[PDB]
Paper text:
Using a high-throughput, single-cell, screening methodology, we were able to recover a panel of 52 tau antibodies from the memory B cell compartment of healthy individuals between the ages of 18 and 66. Crystal structures of both CBTAU-7.1 and CBTAU-22.1 revealed multiple positively charged arginine and lysine residues in the combining sites that are likely to be important for the recognition of the phosphate groups in the phosphorylated peptide epitopes in tau, as in other structurally characterized anti-tau antibodies such as pT231/pS235_1 with phosphorylated peptide pT231/pS235, RB86 with phosphorylated peptide (416–430) and AT8 with phosphorylated peptide (202–209). Binding of both CBTAU-7.1 and CBTAU-22.1 was notably affected by ionic strength, which suggests that binding is stabilized by ionic interactions with involvement of phospho groups in both cases.
For CBTAU-7.1, the framework and all CDR loops can be fully modeled into the high-quality electron density map. Basic residues are prevalent in and around the antibody binding site: Arg96 from light chain (Kabat numbering) and Arg50 from heavy chain are in the combining site and Arg94 and Arg96 from heavy chain line the rim of the presumed binding pocket. These positively charged residues create basic electrostatic pockets on the antibody surface that could play an important role in the phosphopeptide recognition. Antibody CBTAU-7.1 was mapped exclusively to the same peptide region as AT8, but its affinity for the doubly phosphorylated peptide at positions S202 and T205 was much lower than that of AT8 (5.8 µM vs 87.5 nM). However, binding of CBTAU-7.1 appeared to be more promiscuous involving not only phospho-residues on positions S202 and T205, but also combinations of S198 + S202, S198 + T205, S199 + T205, and possibly Y197 + T205. While CBTAU-7.1 binds the same region of tau as murine anti-PHF antibody AT8, it recognizes a slightly different epitope. In particular, CBTAU-7.1 appears to be more promiscuous with respect to the exact residues that need to be phosphorylated and may thus recognize a wider spectrum of phosphorylated tau species. CBTAU-7.1 showed staining of neurofibrillary tangles, pretangles, neuritic plaques and neuropil threads that was comparable to AT8.
Numbering used by the authors:
A (entry chain L): 1 to 27, 27A, 28 to 214
B (entry chain H): 1 to 52, 52A, 53 to 82, 82A, 82B, 82C, 83 to 100, 100A, ...
The structure:
């Protein structure tokens, strides 16, 4: 079948700037049956463009599609924070109606250091035999951040997992949680639990900690 | 206005069968070709099937042909996708969609998640991430740890929806136990703790689990 190749895979641009997205097809796409879609996190895809160049209803004018045979282009000219999305092209001349693999658009903002919070396991959880310790990095930019867990000063590895939010649609920041999982018994063997955070926006590492069972 | 709402998402064993539905409104249903389009987790979009206006004729993607059955009832304004002999690679969000021209899709439903796995369904435990008037500035933070459930998804709201600003509900991660886990957190005023009540509402429909947890400063 037809293969649709998008480029770049990744784009990161400031508001006000212009984004130029490419779709190349492995066959001539007859008439101009090429569509573009926008997909925001946790949302269904939303149609931007059909007929290569015709804007779908309710779509702002700063989205414009061009191209003709194998080469196509989506131009987004005055980026807003809300434009963070994955953008897909789509051929609909022939079954299967093939999509490209997407260009992921991040929109830049100024550097922002995370606010860091640490949470001890609840007494309820402990009663069930495990302890989760949660470290929260809130509303930071850029996405890169480093979290290191210490238990009585010993560096942990392999017993934590991270999760990162998608870029926030209005302030363009990320948040991150790191969760340390121990057995109840292991948790009760140690006193000081600490989360050490490194980020471009912090001039030095931030440590948040507590002593097991104090407050 | 034009809306499409899928139903019937959930867990199914490999080799199993599952039927999806879609209710349609806001337009003349029998005047449009309709499709299913799916999206595996973290992947791109894949067209699944197509039905003509009257329900008599269907086209299927190759990987699906012979196993899926796409039907429509123009009296009930309802689409059905009978899926059979399901496989792991069928795990995806399935979007009900309306076809235009030779096949672009100008309207999409919210989508229904189908998870093909030989595991069994399990509801989350919900634990408080208590705020401290002490160890907290920048000013306060609290949350719920929503742990050990299967499959995706869960919904978390706060105060039955009254609290939305400053809320972050993290993408779930698969734990080495094969069970998912996530936290939902919110930043709140230090002054208001004690006076204000914070409750997280967790819904996990595949297991029929609804939990409310009140989250409070410890003493």
């Amino acid at each position: 079948d037809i293969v649709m190749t998008q480029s770049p895979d990744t784009l990161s641009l400031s508001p006000g700037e212009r984004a130029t997205l490419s779709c190349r097809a492995s066959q001539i796409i007859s008439s101009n049956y090429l569509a573009w879609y926008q997909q925001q996190p946790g949302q269904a895809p939303r149609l931007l463009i059909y007929g290569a160049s015709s804007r779908a209803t309710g779509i702002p004018d700063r989205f414009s599609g061009s191209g003709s045979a194998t080469d196509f282009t989506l131009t987004i000219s005055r980026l807003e924070p809300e434009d963070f999305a994955v953008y897909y092209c789509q051929q609909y001349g022939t079954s299967p109606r093939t999509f490209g693999q997407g260009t992921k658009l991040e929109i830049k903002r100024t550097v922002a250091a995370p606010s860091v919070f640490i949470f001890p396991p609840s007494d309820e959880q402990l009663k069930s035999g495990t302890a989760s310790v949660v470290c929260l990095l809130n509303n930071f930019y850029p996405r890169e951040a480093k979290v290191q867990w210490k238990v009585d000063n010993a560096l942990q590895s392999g017993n934590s997992q991270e999760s990162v939010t998608e870029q926030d649609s209005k302030d363009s920041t990320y948040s991150l949680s790191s969760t340390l999982t121990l057995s109840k018994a292991d948790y009760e063997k140690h006193k000081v639990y600490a989360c050490e955070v490194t980020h471009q926006g912090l001039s030095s590492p931030v440590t948040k900690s507590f002593n097991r069972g104090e407050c | 206005q034009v809306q499409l709402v899928e139903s019937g998402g959930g867990l199914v064993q490999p080799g199993g069968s599952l039927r999806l539905s879609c209710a349609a409104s806001g337009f003349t249903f029998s005047s449009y070709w309709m499709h299913w389009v799916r999206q595996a987790p973290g992947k791109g979009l894949v067209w699944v099937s197509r039905i003509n206006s009257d329900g008599s004729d269907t086209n299927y993607a190759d990987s699906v042909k012979g196993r899926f059955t796409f039907s429509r009832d123009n009296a009930k304004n309802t689409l059905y996708l009978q899926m059979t002999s399901l496989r792991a690679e069928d795990t995806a969000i399935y979007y009900c969609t309306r076809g235009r021209s030779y096949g672009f899709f100008d309207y999409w439903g919210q989508g229904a998640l189908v998870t093909v796995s030989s595991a069994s369904t399990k509801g989350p435990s919900v634990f408080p991430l208590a705020p401290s008037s002490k160890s907290t500035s920048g000013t306060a933070a609290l949350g719920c740890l929503v742990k050990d459930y299967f499959p995706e998804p869960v919904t978390v709201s706060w105060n039955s929806g009254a609290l939305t600003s400053g809320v972050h509900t993290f993408p779930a991660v698969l734990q080495s136990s094969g069970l998912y886990s996530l936290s939902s957190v919110v930043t709140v005023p230090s002054s208001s703790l004690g006076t204000q009540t914070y409750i997280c509402n967790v819904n996990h429909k595949p297991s029929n689990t609804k939990v409310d947890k009140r989250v409070e400063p410890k003493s």
